[PDB]
Amino acid sequence: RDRVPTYQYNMNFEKLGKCIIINNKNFDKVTGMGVRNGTDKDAEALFKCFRSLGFDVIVYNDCSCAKMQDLLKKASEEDHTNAACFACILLSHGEENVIYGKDGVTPIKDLTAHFRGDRCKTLLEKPKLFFIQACRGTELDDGIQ
Amino acid sequence: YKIPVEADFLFAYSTVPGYYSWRSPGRGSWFVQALCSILEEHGKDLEIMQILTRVNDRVARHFESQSDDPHFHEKKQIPCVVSMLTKELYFSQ
């Protein structure tokens, strides 16, 4: 529809922003999780897709929980002053409020907290996007009609 | 003069709380397929919420799980968008 003025995030920056992609395919036997076949297909598709949008895409593979934590903490400490927004995509196993590293599980909240307004001031007032492809429990949707 | 620390966050989950998320070994997860599909087609001219709503519709309609096991046969999926955004979001101009 109509593009009303002061109701849109300001996109006039040197660059659109960074796009972190965590592509977790393999997991340690002890977590009981299996290989996520088809994940490379998604990572490839996502990367080509976001590069096209204007983001500076970075793809990480088979990360441990500590790696995911550190990796995201470091991104939130970089200078985003010249970026319009930030984006992160997580592809892995999961349970309610949790995402799997090859290591084990870590809370989604702790991954995204690094970008709160008070902890990442160069992304303040800028949109912070997180796309999550992971299970959130074990219920099945049978459908209707 | 201040801003909430939790503001301007948007989470696009592939499924609703407590459920499974489906992934095809040959084509990839339903959510990612759909997302890329629509982004390629409208990422440069649709608001982020319009895009995700359309992704919601695509995963809901176009997909249905197929398995040898009767328990996991012909099941559905619906993505879940959580917004704390304070403005409309467009990836261009």
Binding site: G34, R36, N37, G38, S92, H93, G94, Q133, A134, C135 | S14, Y20, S21, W22, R23, S24, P25, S29, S65, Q66, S67, D68, F72
Partner: peptide, 5 residues
């Protein structure tokens, strides 16, 4: 056959 995450 589709698998789950």
């Amino acid at each position: 056959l589709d698998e789950s995450x």
